[PDB]
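Both lines are quoted verbatim for reference:

——
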Amino acid sequence: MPHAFKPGDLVFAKMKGYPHWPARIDDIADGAVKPPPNKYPIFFFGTHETAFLGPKDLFPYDKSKDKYGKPNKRKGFNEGLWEIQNNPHASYS
């Protein structure tokens, strides 16, 4: 049975106006800005952007990749598909 989201989990993350996007739950570094309550720091593969999202916008990657894991014309998306498949836990800073 599922647990709560934890750093390192792989997802497709939904933002308004964007397709479900390959991403991971990030850690928060000591001394770094924390997310709002009930939100997680989401790192988006390909764009390498961070936004704060709740579970309603987070789709576990294994279950969802057949639906969401196809190339998309949007900037950074296809690079993102490569990262989540091939090195999802690397440093992208």
About this structure: Strands lie at 10-13, 21-25, 40-44, 50-53, 58-60.
